[PDB]
Amino acid sequence: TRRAEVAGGGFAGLTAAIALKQNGWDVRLHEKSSELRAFGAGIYLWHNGLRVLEGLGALDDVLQGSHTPPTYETWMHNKSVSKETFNGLPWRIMTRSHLHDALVNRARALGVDISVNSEAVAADPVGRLTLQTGEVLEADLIVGADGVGSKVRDSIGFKQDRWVSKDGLIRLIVPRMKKELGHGEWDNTIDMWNFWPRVQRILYSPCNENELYLGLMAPAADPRGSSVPIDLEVWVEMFPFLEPCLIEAAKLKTARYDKYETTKLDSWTRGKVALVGDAAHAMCPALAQGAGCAMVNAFSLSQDLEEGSSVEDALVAWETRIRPITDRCQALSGDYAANRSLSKGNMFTPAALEAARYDPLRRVYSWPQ
Numbered sequence: 001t002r003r004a005e006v007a008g009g010g011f012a013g014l015t016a017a018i019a020l021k022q023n024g025w026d027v028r029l030h031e032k033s034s035e036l037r038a039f040g041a042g043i044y045l046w047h048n049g050l051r052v053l054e055g056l057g058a059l060d061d062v063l064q065g066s067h068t069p070p071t072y073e074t075w076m077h078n079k080s081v082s083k084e085t086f087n088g089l090p091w092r093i094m095t096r097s098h099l100h101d102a103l104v105n106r107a108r109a110l111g112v113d114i115s116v117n118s119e120a121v122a123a124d125p126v127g128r129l130t131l132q133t134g135e136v137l138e139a140d141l142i143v144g145a146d147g148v149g150s151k152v153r154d155s156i157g158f159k160q161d162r163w164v165s166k167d168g169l170i171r172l173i174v175p176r177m178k179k180e181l182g183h184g185e186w187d188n189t190i191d192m193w194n195f196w197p198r199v200q201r202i203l204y205s206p207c208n209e210n211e212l213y214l215g216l217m218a219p220a221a222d223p224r225g226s227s228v229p230i231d232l233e234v235w236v237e238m239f240p241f242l243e244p245c246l247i248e249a250a251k252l253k254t255a256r257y258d259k260y261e262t263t264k265l266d267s268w269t270r271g272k273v274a275l276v277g278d279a280a281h282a283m284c285p286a287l288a289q290g291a292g293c294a295m296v297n298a299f300s301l302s303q304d305l306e307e308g309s310s311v312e313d314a315l316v317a318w319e320t321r322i323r324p325i326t327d328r329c330q331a332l333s334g335d336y337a338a339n340r341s342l343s344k345g346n347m348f349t350p351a352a353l354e355a356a357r358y359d360p361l362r363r364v365y366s367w368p369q
């Protein structure tokens with residue numbers, strides 16, 4: 001029986017663990033934190049990621065308690081500039097805890113061995129994983145799913161193109177306060193852009209009937225807009241129609257202003273070691289495909305490992321097959337981010353929706369645009 005060691009309990013790590021377990025691997029997943037949990041408030045999932053969930057046997061628990069807006073609307077200075085529904089292309093909004101729990105319950109039901117307070121500090125291409133305590137573990141496959149700053153990746157050494165965003169945002173989960181919002185289309189996803197009187201943007205995303213996912217974006221150089229707890233006055237001023245929700249957001253003393261970095265590597269494999277998720281391809285958040293590609297890649301890895309070839313050969317075949325979809329998505333997302341293309345509306349074109357249209361289960365592209 002083949003054994004796999006997965007470093008990282010994030011969406012990519014859980015996806016890989018479950019996919020491998022389903023194919024008969026003995027699997028152990030290592031999470032450095034003392035508890036299994038996800039940060040980031042909310043998250044968007046598209047057709048490609050929803051298919052992975054179906055392939056993992058975790059779709060049902062995710063759909064129940066999640067939300068699909070009637071439309072994805074964009075505003076520029078409070079003027080609606082577009083409403084797109086992606087020609088039937090499936091998508092869903094949910095809190096990260098909701099998605100994380102579905103994956104963790106599924107992993108537990110399958111018998112995946114989860115170790116907390118277990119931090120991987122090094123990986124050997126020959127099939128060895130070293131923990132922070134010094135303990136060395138041997139396996140037939142090592143999966144590096146430890147996010148940005150990946151110690152597994154850095155212990156082997158990959159050529160890396162790195163970039164860091166000077167500006168960030170505050171992501172929060174607050175009550176819907178739907179009735180207090182009054183007249184409007186408050187079940188819609190609404191990306192509210194503003195450049196005047198100042199640069200402030202809010203991504204409004206309902207997760208279900210009780211929770212609302214908000215993304216408050218302001219320049220790092222803005223002392224008021226980027227502060228946490230949020231500076232209520234400055235947000236209500238440019239988004240008065242959301243005052244009821246903003247009032248609730250101002251009470252979250254745990255809010256944080258997060259920035260991000262992007263990563264592109266020369267390769268994702270080395271011997272029996274495979275890198276997945278952020279550790280391998282963190283990207284700009286514009287297309288909301290970070291977790292989507294991560295899960296597709298983690299799931300595809302388990303597929304290529306079922307061809308009867310050696311793990312080393314399976315890994316390079318995996319990257320050759322699946323990598324182009326991620327590279328292209330990462331690049332386009334990079335362009336959108338830099339040029340603030342989403343502020344124009346109608347930007348979810350066929351090209352931008354390429355990764356979302358991919359169906360990892362049948363390995364073909366669906367929902368034509």
Ligand SMILES: Cc1cc2nc3c(=O)[nH]c(=O)nc-3n(C[C@H](O)[C@H](O)[C@H](O)COP(=O)(O)OP(=O)(O)OC[C@H]3O[C@@H](n4cnc5c(N)ncnc54)[C@H](O)[C@@H]3O)c2cc1C
Nearest residue numbers: 008009010011012032044119120146147277278290291292
């Ligand atoms: C502002 C913003 C908005 C985004 N919105 C979306 C969206 O709407 N939809 C979408 O699909 N994607 C989105 N993304 C991208 C998405 O967040 C990531 O791609 C994905 O969640 C990360 O996958 P991961 O599991 O590989 O990373 P992680 O998320 O961090 O995986 C690593 C986990 O392993 C643990 N760990 C770290 N080091 C070690 C170690 N050495 N040993 C053991 N364990 C370790 C950590 O506790 C960590 O939780 C967004 C990103 C940003 C910055």
